[PDB]
Amino acid sequence: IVGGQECKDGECPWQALLINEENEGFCGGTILSEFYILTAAHCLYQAKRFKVRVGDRNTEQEEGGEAVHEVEVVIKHNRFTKETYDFDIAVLRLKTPITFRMNVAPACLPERDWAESTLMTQKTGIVSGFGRTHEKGRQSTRLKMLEVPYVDRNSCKLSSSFIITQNMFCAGYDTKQEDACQGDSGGPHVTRFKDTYFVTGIVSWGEGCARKGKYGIYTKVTAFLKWIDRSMKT
Amino acid sequence: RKLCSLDNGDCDQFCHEEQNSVVCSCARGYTLADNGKACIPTGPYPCGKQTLE
Numbered sequence A: 001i002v003g004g005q006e007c008k009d010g011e012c013p014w015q016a017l018l019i020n021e022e023n024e025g026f027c028g029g030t031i032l033s034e035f036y037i038l039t040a041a042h043c044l045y046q047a048k049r050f051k052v053r054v055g056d057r058n059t060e061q062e063e064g065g066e067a068v069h070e071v072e073v074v075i076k077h078n079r080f081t082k083e084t085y086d087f088d089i090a091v092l093r094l095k096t097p098i099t100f101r102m103n104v105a106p107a108c109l110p111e112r113d114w115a116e117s118t119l120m121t122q123k124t125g126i127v128s129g130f131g132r133t134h135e136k137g138r139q140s141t142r143l144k145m146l147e148v149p150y151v152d153r154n155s156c157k158l159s160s161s162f163i164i165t166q167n168m169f170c171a172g173y174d175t176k177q178e179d180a181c182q183g184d185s186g187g188p189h190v191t192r193f194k195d196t197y198f199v200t201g202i203v204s205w206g207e208g209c210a211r212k213g214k215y216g217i218y219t220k221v222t223a224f225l226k227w228i229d230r231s232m233k234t
Numbered sequence B: 001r002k003l004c005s006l007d008n009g010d011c012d013q014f015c016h017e018e019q020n021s022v023v024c025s026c027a028r029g030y031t032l033a034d035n036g037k038a039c040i041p042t043g044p045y046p047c048g049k050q051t052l053e
């Protein structure tokens, strides 16, 4: 996260972190239930083997909310193409259940018709992660959040040097140097309604980070709600 | 605005206009109250709520 605020105790409990073979986190995630984690599809080609850590706020210091889980069944969208990043969605079924607590909680999956009319018409959303603090920078040792406004789809298409598909949406600022970045990838974009946070987006991509006239591109989770629902059985 | 468009039909969470009349539903880990509008947590740490506890 370039700029923004840091997640205090219990503020971003749905945040998951995918850690490679050398203990280091490479991607973000979202807790959907005690067995399931939501992430971007492109995170699967980052490393050959990974696990999921929950309740982390500091990569250096062991927190006490930290717990590591092994991924059992990896489910990727069979239409994900890495040339357009279309269908950038993946589901991770864990071997052992997640204990919900301080810093560890799931995020609600919304209903398709309601979210489009209610959550998508809200002013802002919240993105969080352990990503880069600058475009050229390094991973953040601390968990950070940012209030990202929903960007009009018409302006979203005109700013992008790449295709914006139906399964994507724009969020962020025009010039204000605040955005998500590399490492935040696959992390949570949640929207608040009556002090309850619902999953709306997955951190997918952006032309660099915090560039003027560019926005954060997020996987439109609402276009995949039936697909995720099917996954959360076996 | 009308119904679900006007103040979410007075639902805590999901709203759908089921025969003009508003019918509310809740996310997993919640249960619908007797008023049919509120969402009540099943246990500790339900989805969506910040765990300041």
Ligand SMILES: CN1CCN(C(=O)[C@H](CNC(=O)c2ccc(Cl)s2)NS(=O)(=O)c2cc(F)cc(N3CCCCC3=O)c2Cl)CC1
Pocket (backbone or CB within 6 Å): A042, A082, A083, A084, A085, A162, A179, A180, A181, A182, A183, A184, A185, A203, A204, A205, A206, A207, A208, A209, A210, A215, A216, A217, A218
């Ligand atoms: C593998 N990983 C590399 C880093 N990455 C990027 O999008 C980078 C840095 N920016 C970001 O990660 C984000 C910025 C804003 C949000 Cl939200 S995520 N922007 S980038 O220009 O360096 C970049 C890297 C990359 F690997 C892929 C792409 N894209 C963008 C979509 C079109 C095809 C493509 O390869 C792009 Cl634009 C996500 C994917």
Ligand SMILES: [Ca+2]
Pocket (backbone or CB within 6 Å): A055, A056, A057, A058, A059, A060, A061, A062, A063, A064, A066
């Ligand atoms: Ca820690």
